[PDB]
C-alpha cells in the first residue's frame, strides 16, 4: 500500500513539506509555553525583541527562521500550484502544455506578488518614508533595529526569493528563452536583500522591493490574460508599461539621485568604527553598484518591452 503513497508523493510533491511544517507547528503550539525559551519559537517567530517595545535586532535566529520559511514557501508553491491552479486552468478550456505551464507559473506569480506588494505598501505607509520620502534614508543610519512588521516582511521576502533562486539552481528541465539575465536578476536580488539587511539600512531597501513587486504583479497579470483569451490584454499591457516606467525607472532614478547627492553632497561620511558608521566612500560604492545593476537590467527589459510594443502595433 506504500506504493500508492509513493505515487501520491510523485504526483503531489507537497505532502512532505506539509507534514514536516505541521509537525513543527503542532509541537510548538502544544508545548504549553509560547515564549522565547523554546527553540521552535526560534524557528517560527522573529527573534531579538527589544525589551517589549516594537523594535527588533538581528543575529542567527534570523537564518533559522529563513530556513523554516524556506520549507514553508516550497510547500506553498507546490500545494497551491497543483491543487488550486491546475484544475482551474483546465476549466479555462486552454488546452496545451507549453502555454498551460507558463500560465501556471504566471498565475502563481500573481498570487504571491499580490500578497506581497500591498503588504509592503502597508509597511511603508506606517513609516517616515510616506510615498517614498527619500529624506528619511538619511535619518538614523546605523539603526540596529526594525519594526516587527518591517522585519517579518523583510525576511519573508528574503526566504521567498532565495527559494526561487535555489529552484532555479536545481535546473528542473527547461529554463526558457530568457534565462541568463533572469538568473542574473535573482542573484542580484538576493545579494541586495542580504546586503541591505546585514549593513543595517533597510529603509533604503524597502522602496525598491515595492517597485519590484508591483511591477511583477501587473506583468504576470497581463501575461496570463494574454495567454488566456485576451479581450483587453492591450489596455492591461498599456497600464503595465505606464506603471512600469513610472514606478521602476522613475523611482529608481529618484532613489539613485537621492542616495548619490544626499549621502555624497555632504560632509558627513566618516568611519568611526564602533558605531558601525561607515556610511562613507566604502559602503556607498557597493550598494550603488548593486542598484545600478538592477536599474541597468530594468532598462534592458524596457528595451525588450519597447520592441514588443513596436512589433505589435506595427501589424
Q: Give SS3 for 214.
A: helix
What is the residue whose three cell numbers read 532613489? 255
CB atoms within 10 A of CB 27: 12
Q: How far apart are CA 205 and CA 209, in angstroms?
A: 7
Q: How far apart are CA 153 and CA 67, in angstroms?
A: 15
- In the complex with another protein, the residue whose CB is nearer, 258 or 276, is 276
Q: Is 196 annotated as a binding residue?
A: yes
Q: Is 46 annotated as a binding residue?
A: no
Which residues would be at the binding site for another protein (CB under 8 A)? Answer: 63, 166, 169-171, 194, 198, 270-276
Q: Is 248 annotated as a binding residue?
A: yes
- In the complex with another protein, the residue whose CB is nearer, 19 or 169, is 169
Q: How far is the CB of 53 from another protein (least distance, A)?
A: 17
Task: Please state the separation of Cα 102 from the chain's center in Å.
Answer: 20
Q: Is 288 annotated as a binding residue?
A: no
Q: How far is the CB of 141 from another protein (least distance, A)?
A: 14
Q: How far is the CB of 240 from another protein (least distance, A)?
A: 33
Please name which of 295, 301, 135 lies closest in space to residue 211, comparing C-alpha atoms: 295
Q: How far is the CB of 62 from another protein (least distance, A)?
A: 11
- In the complex with another protein, the residue whose CB is nearer, 166 or 253, is 166
Contact 281, 292 (CB under 8 A): no
Q: For residue 272, what are the β-bridge partners?
A: none
Q: Is 312 annotated as a binding residue?
A: yes
Give the annotated binding-site residues for fumonisin B1: 99, 102, 112, 161, 185, 216, 219, 223, 226-227, 233-234, 237, 244, 301, 305, 308, 312, 315
Amino acid at each position: 500500500i506504500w506504493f500508492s503513497f509513493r505515487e501520491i508523493s510523485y504526483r503531489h510533491a507537497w505532502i512532505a513539506p506539509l507534514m514536516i511544517l505541521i509537525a513543527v507547528y503542532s509541537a510548538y503550539f502544544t508545548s504549553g509555553n509560547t515564549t522565547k525559551t523554546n527553540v521552535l519559537h526560534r524557528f517560527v517567530a522573529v527573534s531579538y525583541q527589544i525589551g517589549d517595545t516594537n523594535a527588533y535586532g538581528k543575529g542567527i535566529n534570523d537564518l533559522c527562521f529563513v530556513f523554516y520559511y524556506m520549507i514553508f514557501f516550497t510547500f506553498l508553491r507546490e500545494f497551491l500550484m497543483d491543487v488550486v491552479i491546475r484544475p482551474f486552468a483546465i476549466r479555462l478550456h486552454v488546452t496545451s502544455k507549453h502555454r498551460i505551464k507558463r500560465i501556471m507559473e504566471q498565475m502563481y506569480a500573481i498570487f504571491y506578488t499580490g500578497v506581497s506588494g500591498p503588504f509592503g505598501i502597508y509597511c511603508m505607509y506606517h513609516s517616515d518614508l510616506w510615498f517614498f520620502n527619500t529624506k528619511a534614508m538619511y535619518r538614523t543610519y546605523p539603526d540596529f533595529t526594525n519594526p516587527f512588521l518591517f522585519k517579518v516582511f523583510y525576511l519573508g521576502q528574503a526566504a521567498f526569493w532565495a527559494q526561487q533562486a535555489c529552484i532555479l539552481v536545481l535546473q528542473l528541465e527547461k529554463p526558457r528563452k530568457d534565462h541568463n539575465e533572469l538568473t542574473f536578476h535573482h542573484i542580484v536580488t538576493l545579494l541586495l536583500i542580504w546586503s541591505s539587511y546585514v549593513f543595517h539600512f533597510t529603509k533604503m531597501g524597502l522602496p525598491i522591493y515595492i517597485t519590484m513587486d508591483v511591477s511583477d504583479f501587473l506583468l504576470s497579470f497581463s501575461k496570463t490574460l494574454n495567454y488566456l483569451d485576451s479581450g483587453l490584454a492591450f489596455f492591461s499591457f498599456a497600464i503595465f508599461v505606464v506603471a512600469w516606467i513610472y514606478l521602476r525607472h522613475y523611482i529608481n532614478l529618484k532613489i539613485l539621485w537621492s542616495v548619490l547627492t544626499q549621502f555624497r553632497t555632504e560632509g558627513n561620511y566618516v568611519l568611526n568604527f564602533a558605531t558601525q558608521q561607515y556610511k562613507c566612500w566604502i559602503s556607498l560604492p557597493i550598494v550603488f553598484v548593486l542598484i545600478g545593476a538592477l536599474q541597468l537590467v530594468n532598462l534592458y527589459w524596457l528595451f525588450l518591452i519597447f520592441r514588443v510594443l513596436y512589433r505589435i502595433l506595427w501589424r
